[PDB]
Amino acid sequence: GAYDAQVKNDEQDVELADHEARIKQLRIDVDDHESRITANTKAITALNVRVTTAEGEIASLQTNVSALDGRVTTAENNISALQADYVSKTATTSQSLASPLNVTTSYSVGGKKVLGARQTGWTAATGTANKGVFDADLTFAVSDTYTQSEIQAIANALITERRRTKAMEDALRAHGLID
Amino acid sequence: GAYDAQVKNDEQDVELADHEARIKQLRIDVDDHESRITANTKAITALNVRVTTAEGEIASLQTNVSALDGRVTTAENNISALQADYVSKTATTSQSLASPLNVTTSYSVGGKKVLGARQTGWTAATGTANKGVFDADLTFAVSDTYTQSEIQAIANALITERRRTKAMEDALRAHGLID
Amino acid sequence: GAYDAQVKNDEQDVELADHEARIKQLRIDVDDHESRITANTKAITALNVRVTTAEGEIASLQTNVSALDGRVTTAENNISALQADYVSKTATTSQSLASPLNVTTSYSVGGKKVLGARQTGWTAATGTANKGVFDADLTFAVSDTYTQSEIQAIANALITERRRTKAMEDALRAHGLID
Ligand SMILES: [Ca+2]
Numbered sequence: 001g002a003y004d005a006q007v008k009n010d011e012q013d014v015e016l017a018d019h020e021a022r023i024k025q026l027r028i029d030v031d032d033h034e035s036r037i038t039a040n041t042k043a044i045t046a047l048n049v050r051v052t053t054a055e056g057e058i059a060s061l062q063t064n065v066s067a068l069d070g071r072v073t074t075a076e077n078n079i080s081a082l083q084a085d086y087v088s089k090t091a092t093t094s095q096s097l098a099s100p101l102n103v104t105t106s107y108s109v110g111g112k113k114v115l116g117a118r119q120t121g122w123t124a125a126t127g128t129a130n131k132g133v134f135d136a137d138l139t140f141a142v143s144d145t146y147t148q149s150e151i152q153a154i155a156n157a158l159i160t161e162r163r164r165t166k167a168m169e170d171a172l173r174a175h176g177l178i179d
Numbered sequence: 180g181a182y183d184a185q186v187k188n189d190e191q192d193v194e195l196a197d198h199e200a201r202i203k204q205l206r207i208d209v210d211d212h213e214s215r216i217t218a219n220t221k222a223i224t225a226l227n228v229r230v231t232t233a234e235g236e237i238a239s240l241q242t243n244v245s246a247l248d249g250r251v252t253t254a255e256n257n258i259s260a261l262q263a264d265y266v267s268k269t270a271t272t273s274q275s276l277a278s279p280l281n282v283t284t285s286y287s288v289g290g291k292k293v294l295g296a297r298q299t300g301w302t303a304a305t306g307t308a309n310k311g312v313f314d315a316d317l318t319f320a321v322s323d324t325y326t327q328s329e330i331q332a333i334a335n336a337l338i339t340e341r342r343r344t345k346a347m348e349d350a351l352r353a354h355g356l357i358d
Numbered sequence: 359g360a361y362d363a364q365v366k367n368d369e370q371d372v373e374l375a376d377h378e379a380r381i382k383q384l385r386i387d388v389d390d391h392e393s394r395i396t397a398n399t400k401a402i403t404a405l406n407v408r409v410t411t412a413e414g415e416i417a418s419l420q421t422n423v424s425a426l427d428g429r430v431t432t433a434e435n436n437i438s439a440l441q442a443d444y445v446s447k448t449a450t451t452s453q454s455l456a457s458p459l460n461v462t463t464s465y466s467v468g469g470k471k472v473l474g475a476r477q478t479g480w481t482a483a484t485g486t487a488n489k490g491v492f493d494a495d496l497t498f499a500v501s502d503t504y505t506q507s508e509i510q511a512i513a514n515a516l517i518t519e520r521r522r523t524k525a526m527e528d529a530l531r532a533h534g535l536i537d
Pocket residue numbers: 008009012187188191366367370
């Protein structure tokens with residue numbers, strides 16, 4: 001019917017123009033997606049680098065924290081041991097040592113010197129030591145005339161006195177106050 | 180004008196061929212974007228897993244570091260307390276205790292034993308103790324003939340001597356050197 | 359040849375229909391990619407925030423761990439110093455001080471008081487001190503009749519005895535047991 005071909009060609013041109021416009025817009029979108037996907041991949045790659053670095057610093061930190069925890073626990077136990085075992089300057093309850101003690105120069109009680117270096121130059125007394133009955137209020141009769149028994153009593157008490165002096169000397173030497 | 184339809188159909192074919200080529204290239208690009216976007220999403224998902232894990236290890240580390248900081252500070256204060264309060268083996272300035280002290284076996288001064296266990300077996304002296312005037316250069320007259328006053332002087336000095344011995348014994352017992 | 363134009367227009371319509379279908383599917387894919395790329399970018403942005411935060415917490419942790427390591431090492435050296443230098447309550451080997459020692463109230467050996475505060479009220483003895491030869495088994499002859507030499511011997515031994523008592527008193531005063 002003569003006219004269809006012009007109508008058909010015209011409408012095909014309309015559809016061709018529509019397709020042309022749609023391809024252009026698709027091309028615009030895909031070209032812009034290209035940039036965006038390229039950018040996203042680059043950022044993801046960069047993100048993996050810093051996270052990998054972070055992972056490398058975390059496991060190292062965890063190692064150090066575990067090592068530190070071990071050294072504090074040891075220190076805490078050494079401190080506990082020292083606290084139970086050390087001699088205090090400020091404690092008021094009597095403190096006792098399981099060992100001998102040596103110090104320089106002096107021992108003191110209440111700020112006054114009571115004990116010091118061993119005193120030397122002694123020649124040790126000989127004979128009997130008297131640690132028995134001793135009456136320092138023992139007195140003596142003295143007559144107007146010579147009495148043997150009265151002189152004997154004086155001599156006897158002089159002997160018990162000298163033997164008491166030796167006994168005391170023995171105690172100082174055995175302690176070590178004198179040589 | 181007869182010829183236009185062939186010219187029109189030919190140019191439409193040219194445009195159809197152009198569209199065909201452009202759809203192909205778009206299809207190539209979108210198909211390749213599909214893979215890339217799929218890959219990026221998978222990587223992002225995987226990145227969130229490890230970061231979430233990292234966050235889980237950081238806040239735990241921060242907890243442990245804060246706990247460790249607390250235990251060192253306590254330890255540092257215990258150390259400070261021990262340093263101020265402990266008795267030193269190497270310190271040269273005199274050190275003083277606020278408490279009684281007991282040790283095993285001996286006390287010593289300068290490497291020599293000066294004091295030890297209490298000496299036992301003593302029977303305590305009785306009578307007067309003499310801590311007053313005492314002249315150890317006190318001498319005595321002795322005549323060719325018996326003289327009461329001369330014997331009395333000897334006896335008197337024997338008494339003051341025995342009372343001085345008792346006084347000294349009192350001091351050792353009160354300290355505790357003897358029982 | 360009359361018929362080609364209808365055949366040509368028909369096949370162009372077929373190709374137009376094919377292009378139309380392909381543009382639709384491309385449009386579907388690109389529209390869906392748009393959402394996905396938008397979502398991926400948003401997630402990447404959000405990932406960078408938390409990683410940046412994580413980086414901010416890691417370098418701070420590394421700072422604290424390094425600071426803690428420094429404080430434990432110092433503490434460990436203070437502990438070592440205390441262990442070598444402190445006086446132990448439980449050690450059995452004799453312990454020695456380089457300094458004088460003062461304590462409250464008493465010194466004790468084996469649980470018994472042996473030493474205490476300085477004894478006062480003494481008037482210092484005068485004269486000769488005897489730290490030489492001393493025989494406490496020295497005895498004396500006593501006749502039925504007055505004998506000057508026998509009385510002299512008693513007096514002489516009384517003098518050496520009093521001088522020995524002074525010698526002992528000197529030792530206690532020099533140590534500090536008495537004033
Ligand atoms: Ca046509």
